[PDB]
Paper text:
SycD (specific Yop chaperone D) from the enteropathogen Yersinia enterocolitica is the class II chaperone of the translocator proteins YopD (Yersinia outer protein D) and YopB (Yersinia outer protein B). Like all known class II chaperones SycD exhibits an all α-helical structure. Six helices (H1A, H1B, H2A, H2B, H3A, H3B) fold into three tetratricopeptide repeats (TPRs), tandemly arranged motifs of some 34 amino acids length.
In order to verify that YopD binds to SycD via the proposed sequence motif 58PELIKP63 we co-crystallized N- and C-terminally truncated SycD21-163 with a synthetic peptide corresponding to YopD56-65 (56QVPELIKPSQ65). The chaperone peptide complex crystallized in the trigonal space group P3121 with one monomer per asymmetric unit. The Fo-Fc difference map clearly revealed positive electron density within the concave groove of SycD21-163, which allowed the easy positioning of the peptide residues 56’-64’ whereas Gln65’ could not be placed due to missing electron density. The peptide binds in an extended form into the chaperone’s hydrophobic cleft that is lined by aromatic and aliphatic residues from helix H1A and H2A. The region of the concave groove that binds Pro58’ has a mixed hydrophobic and polar character and is formed by Tyr47 (H1A), Ala78 (H2A), Gln81 (H2A), Tyr93 (H2B) and His109 (H3A). Direct hydrogen bonds are formed between the hydroxyls of SycD Tyr40 and Tyr47 and the carbonyl oxygen of the peptide residues Ile61’ and Pro58’, respectively, and between the guanidino group of Arg146 (H8) and the side chain of Gln56’. The residues lining the concave groove do not show significant conformational changes between the apo and the peptide-bound form, suggesting a preformed and largely rigid binding site. The peptide’s three conserved anchor residues bind into distinct binding pockets within the concave region leading to a peptide conformation that is nearly identical to that of the CBDs of PopD and IpaB in complex with their respective chaperones.
Residue numbers in the entry:
A (entry chain B): 56 to 64
B (entry chain A): 29 to 159
Write the structure that this text describes.
Amino acid sequence: QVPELIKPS
Amino acid sequence: NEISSDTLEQLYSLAFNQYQSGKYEDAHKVFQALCVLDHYDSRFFLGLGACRQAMGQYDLAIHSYSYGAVMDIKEPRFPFHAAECLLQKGELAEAESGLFLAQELIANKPEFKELSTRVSSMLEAIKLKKE
């Protein structure tokens, strides 16, 4: 479980 | 020379994809350069901090999250991920503020539902320690 990033485009 | 285009989106997608493949070292290099190209975009700092978190680099992670927090004061993901890092360093009072702040920024917004539960779980663990 690593941090969740903002999805691209 | 920042008449650089939205090839920035191409770079973000690549870094994003490297991160999902667990290539944190490579992703961090791309995110770092993105932070240089556009130091106002908060996704780049979330990304950079996330790579440092993933690799156990807690102080560096907190540093990137802090920057992100400055440019996006409404974004709860920054104090929440910083609170995780501060917890790993055994800095509970600082982590608590982080979580309380995240909780304020999330409010009752539907999109942060699961993130609210993690926040409450952590606040409850720190609360009991002070007994």
